[PDB]
Design a protein around this nucleic acid. Sequence first.
DNA 1: CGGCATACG
DNA 2: CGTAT
DNA 3: GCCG
Length: 326
Amino acid sequence: MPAYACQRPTPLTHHNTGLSEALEILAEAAGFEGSEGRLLTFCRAASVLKALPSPVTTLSQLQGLPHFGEHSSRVVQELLEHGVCEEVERVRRSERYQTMKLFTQIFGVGVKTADRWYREGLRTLDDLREQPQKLTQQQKAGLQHHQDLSTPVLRSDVDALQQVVEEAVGQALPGATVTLTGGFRRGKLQGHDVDFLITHPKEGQEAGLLPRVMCRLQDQGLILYHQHFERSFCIFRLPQPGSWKAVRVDLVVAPVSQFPFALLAWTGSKLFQRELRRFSRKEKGLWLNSHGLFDPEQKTFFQAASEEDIFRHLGLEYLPPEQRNA
DNA sequence: CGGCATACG
DNA sequence: CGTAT
DNA sequence: GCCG
Ligand SMILES: [Cl-]
Ligand SMILES: [Mg+2]
Ligand SMILES: [Mg+2]
Ligand code: NA
Ligand code: NA
């Protein structure tokens, strides 16, 4: 079992679902307390289990797996022995965990804002609605739309949204293209937002594109919220039988020279990309981001024409998006 | 022990 | 500070 | 929390 998640296939569904979910609770709780190192370790340990070819049934099967030390091994041991891990259950029922989860799920609220509100004694969404002068406009939109944004987005929703984005993109810049990214490109059947990447085959033609797209969507009455650039974090009005619902949509523009890097980055998963960037820098001495891959010795950028190019230039076996679900 | 991904709004 | 993979 |  390789030590980096980008060195091994990780499918969307797997054979250790309960064990990985428990470790991911501890990762999330670590993040709520600002412990980024422990969050990473628990996420990595969870991801190792997702990559295994069969269920873990005995503690000895963890021997030699990367990212399993005393703490993660004890969690697994308790789940195998008793079906429950007391630490995990203690986190789950705690007022701190439940409130930080509720608050950080709000669009416009991060861990730092949630933690401050918690320390002020706030606990519920209606607590927040009672003092709206404290909220940013983004937080107001996140709170107004919270119920809809909590409802899973389905594949049929994605197909509808892609058509309306393509229509607006086509008037904004003929020849521009729209690619579905994020979790839906990795094969998810449900999600909580939809991610799109926009480019144009002629380098430079994509400059200034996103304002033109957003204005056209807003004039069609489809935008319930946006920040007004190359990234837009929107709330869309999606038609529903007899009504509609609010959906989070992210629109990203990249020049075609950078498209493979942006596609790779925005397809994720989040942990896959962190691990890939860590692998690039620490094992290969190259600096990876959503714009390119830089050789800091020669001071040169690697031209890529495809995701396959990028995996080759990092010495990694290619993984399709469906196997990047770290 | 240091390190833990890297960006944009 | 928030957002994203 | 775990790795090199
Ligand atoms: Cl980036
Ligand atoms: Mg997404
Ligand atoms: Mg997200
Ligand atoms: Na949030
Ligand atoms: Na998104």
